[PDB]
């Protein structure tokens, strides 16, 4: 059996808090701030993911190129293995060839 | 795991309902009844 007999606790979801009320704000700062800043420097996150999108290959190559020297041993090792596998996969495997 | 089915019980038990009156282990088990209910239909 996988189903549960009794119900779970009811979720409290405060739809009016700091982030949910201030959400999306200062996203047009570039458009109506005399273009002093672009919204892409607004997002807080990794250094290689800032106003940039890409698939697995692009993301891993960008990671190792940008912050690769700061990587741990096992992490860089499995990252290189991943990009090697993905190279040969994306280039050799699938339909449309 | 991020997406998992919770209503499998019901989706199988409607078939088990159609298969209650059968004889043997078909009425009880599922994969044995699936091969039979479509046949009955």
């Amino acid at each position: 059996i996988g189903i549960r007999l009794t119900l779970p606790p009811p979720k409290v979801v405060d739809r009016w808090n700091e982030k949910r009320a201030m959400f999306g704000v200062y996203d047009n700062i570039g458009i109506l701030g005399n273009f002093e800043k672009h919204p892409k420097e607004l997002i807080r996150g990794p250094i290689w993911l800032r106003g940039w999108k890409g698939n697995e290959l692009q993301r891993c190559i960008r990671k190792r190129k940008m912050v690769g020297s700061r990587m741990f041993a096992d992490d860089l090792h499995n990252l290189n293995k991943r990009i090697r596998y993905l190279y040969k996969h994306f280039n050799r495997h699938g339909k449309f060839r | 795991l991020r997406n998992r089915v919770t209503d499998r019980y019901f989706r199988i038990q409607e078939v088990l309902k159609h298969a209650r009156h059968f004889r043997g282990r078909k009425n009880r088990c599922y994969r044995l009844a699936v091969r039979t209910v479509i046949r009955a239909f």
Partner: peptide, 26 residues
């Protein structure tokens, strides 16, 4: 444990139905 409670609600309904069939009130 599996997340979600819609199925748990449906199953509570089925359980109470079965309970009524087992010991239905007058």
């Amino acid at each position: 444990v599996k997340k979600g409670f819609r199925a748990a609600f449906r199953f509570q309904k089925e359980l109470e139905r079965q309970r009524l069939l087992r010991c239905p009130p007058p």
